[PDB]
Design a protein around this ligand. Structure first.
Ligand SMILES: Nc1ncnc2c1ncn2[C@@H]1O[C@H](COP(=O)(O)OP(=O)(O)NP(=O)(O)O)[C@@H](O)[C@H]1O
Ligand SMILES: Nc1ncnc2c1ncn2[C@@H]1O[C@H](COP(=O)(O)OP(=O)(O)NP(=O)(O)O)[C@@H](O)[C@H]1O
Ligand SMILES: CCCc1cc(=O)oc2c(C(=O)N3CCCc4ccccc43)c(OCCO)ccc12
Ligand SMILES: CCCc1cc(=O)oc2c(C(=O)N3CCCc4ccccc43)c(OCCO)ccc12
Ligand SMILES: [Cl-]
Ligand SMILES: [Cl-]
Ligand SMILES: [Mg+2]
Ligand SMILES: [Mg+2]
Lengths: 386, 385
């Protein structure tokens, strides 16, 4: 019971491994209903058992790839490989690579700096209003820390060089840096073997693969002008509306009627789909291709427009409250937000106030008119009649 | 557009001030309905405008004081002072002080280590199953980083010394360490001036004071055997049940009947109150005296017991879903959880699975039967019909 045993100081790396929850989410098993992509079945809603932290280190690299489309509009493809037997995940993107040159301040090559050193980012200057998902300078290093092997390969024609270096043992050591002359099409490829012992797992089982695959479909549905491949197979997704259809296709309410779906691409930064829900308020949303599974002010900003307008209709007739109207809604929101803020590194809840979004999302009078007639008002009027 | 301007590395301290959101919450104004204690009406539900990050650095020090009751059960009092004119907040507790001695490993005095160095804590050894709120070793340093002046004073009789040192300019520099002989009642007092420029605030206005005051009432209601004083005024709270009453005050539902309250202190680590909600599912919960404003598995663990039993009854008299039963519930939970986990440093959502709680909270059949007899089952049986 000595003072030095009671009061302890931890390094940054030690703290991440000792307290992973605020960095990557829970490292313990979770059992809950999720949307997944099952082989031969597609998008479906079922109970899944998985470790959030493992899902998240995959997500960090995948979002980083999508971020490059904002950095370089010439980027066109993301290629994802998932090899459960060899415990191997690879994420590849074209467009401009990372500059392969020595950082004059930190005195090391840039790819080694931003992948092997904590708190390193190109998103630290918020005078630039960016719609990338990267914000904090942790993501890629967290995947590195929770991998037994983590390899960065990036090629920059501008610098006429290609970079390749491997980290091992939870970013505890690095292999040899490979520099080669390069004069081809730029690319970046991140290949890592997740440290499954950190997650009390033995392999990338059916459930986590089904989640990682559905996440690849998310990227295909949330980005623009980006082809997404999964294990060499192109994913058949064209726009957010076709992605949303994969959830609603052939769904029926309890009475037997097909779900009425209201859609509007409000502008180049907002796309909204609205249908009816029988299990309370449901939302599926994305901010800068991040799956905001706890929602955020972008979801409230869209849903509160619909709720207030629907409440005004029930008030002409018939005492109703907004939460009663909201529990009949299932909304899909794909948004591009400038310099978003979140509650945590996992970025599941987007906290930025609408006045700082950098854009607006006023639903058309056509959308609202289609929403007053989607049966939500009918399901509220029959309740007041009781 | 040079490489060194594009790709930058930040120190831990720089990152906290540059990206405060994951550390303390939003540093921008928020307008939402909150429970506050106003100087003329008391506990009431109204719209408030405040900066979460400023509220949180107050919460970090306040929860630290409550943690000391777990460290030293002989501790009995917390005294909080809020002086808006001089921008001065102090949080004082009795019980055992911090050991005043040089840390043999980090080579500095213990209070200077755990208040002036990031990632320093007594809660890093999870072989000890503790029910304190502190987990990550950030809290006090974050308040320090977001203050223009931050002073730590703690007196340890065991070491017969008293410690006092001041940090200034967002923990950018530290004053002189003052060591004096001590032989009185142990205490710890944290006094800080919040850096209102970091929060774009001109003063500690009515709304942020009302929030800080209600939080002191939370501590008085969530802890055991702790008197809480605010500006020399004792808070009249004795136990969790009396605290919950301050919210309901015999107020009436939409029909005009007084709200029926079902209560059970299941054991020494769980106390639950259940009434009726007319605005959807409401929860007011605490884990190790932390206000878990986003809920967590401690709330699900309690609420789902009620939901499962109420669903079992409506099926006997008949298609029902769990969310419809839950949207009529307003639940209060005061829980002590071993080594809890949360989504973020703000600890608003408690993520630990029930199998790691260190205790159980199985509601008595009397409590369940008392829940079967509220209007929740009645308001649902007629709807399915
Ligand atoms: N696929 C990629 N192509 C090009 N640059 C990349 C790629 N992935 C990462 N980077 C760069 O590497 C930096 C570090 O990535 P990362 O550690 O994820 O931090 P971040 O994305 O900026 N912020 P965050 O993910 O919120 O912690 C990024 O800021 C980019 O500049
Ligand atoms: N009022 C107090 N009385 C006694 N010890 C205290 C007091 N406040 C803080 N401490 C000690 O100082 C340490 C540092 O506090 P803090 O920075 O808040 O980290 P923490 O409470 O351990 N975890 P967290 O608050 O979740 O980041 C605590 O672990 C306690 O051991
Ligand atoms: C700890 C994991 C957090 C998470 C990540 C994720 O990736 O997905 C999730 C989904 C989900 O499967 N989806 C579908 C597509 C992407 C998305 C954005 C927002 C909300 C939900 C979802 C979900 O489902 C709840 C029932 O609906 C619940 C949670 C998640
Ligand atoms: C960013 C601020 C987070 C927060 C801190 C806090 O301190 O309070 C809150 C309350 C609140 O006022 N209370 C009452 C007492 C303590 C508590 C525990 C859990 C939940 C809620 C609350 C609240 O209200 C929601 C509508 O009810 C909503 C949020 C908070
Ligand atoms: Cl978040
Ligand atoms: Cl949290
Ligand atoms: Mg990133
Ligand atoms: Mg603390």
């Amino acid at each position: 019971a000595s003072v030095e045993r009671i009061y302890q100081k931890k390094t940054q790396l030690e703290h991440i491994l000792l307290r992973p929850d605020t960095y990557i989410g829970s490292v313990e098993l979770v059992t809950q209903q999720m949307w997944v992509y099952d082989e031969d079945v597609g998008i479906n809603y079922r109970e899944v058992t998985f470790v959030p932290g493992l899902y998240k280190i995959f997500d960090e690299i995948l979002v980083n790839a999508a971020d490059n489309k904002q950095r370089d509009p010439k980027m066109s493809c993301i290629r994802v490989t998932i090899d459960p037997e060899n415990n191997l995940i690879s994420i590849w993107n074209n467009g401009k690579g990372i500059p392969v040159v020595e950082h004059k301040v930190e005195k090391m090559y840039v790819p080694a700096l931003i992948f092997g050193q904590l708190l390193t980012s190109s998103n630290y200057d918020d005078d630039e209003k960016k719609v990338t998902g990267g914000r904090n300078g942790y993501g890629a290093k967290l995947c590195n820390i929770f991998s037994t092997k983590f390899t960065v390969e990036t090629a920059s024609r501008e610098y006429k060089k290609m970079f390749k270096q491997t980290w091992m043992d939870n970013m505890g050591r690095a292999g040899e840096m490979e520099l080669k002359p390069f004069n081809g099409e730029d690319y970046t490829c991140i290949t890592f073997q997740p440290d499954l012992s950190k997650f009390k797992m033995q392999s990338l089982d059916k459930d986590i693969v089904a989640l990682m695959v559905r996440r690849a479909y998310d990227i295909a549905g949330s980005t623009k002008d980006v082809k997404v491949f999964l294990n060499g197979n192109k994913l058949p997704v064209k726009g957010f509306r076709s992605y949303v259809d994969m959830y609603l296709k052939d769904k029926l309410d309890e009475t037997g009627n097909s779900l009425k779906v209201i859609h509007e691409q409000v502008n180049h930064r907002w796309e909204v789909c609205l249908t009816m829900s029988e299990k309370g308020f449901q939302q599926i949303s994305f901010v800068n291709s991040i799956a905001t599974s706890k929602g955020g002010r972008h979801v409230d900003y869209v849903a509160d427009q619909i709720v207030t307008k629907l409440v005004d209709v029930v008030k002409k007739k018939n005492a109703v409250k907004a939460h009663q109207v909201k529990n009949h809604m299932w909304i899909f929101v794909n948004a591009l937000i400038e310099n978003p803020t979140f509650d945590s590194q996992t970025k599941e809840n987007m906290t930025l106030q609408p006045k700082s979004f950098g854009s607006t999302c006023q639903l058309s009078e056509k959308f609202i008119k289609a929403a007053i007639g989607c049966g939500i008002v009918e399901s509220i009027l029959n309740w007041v009649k009781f």
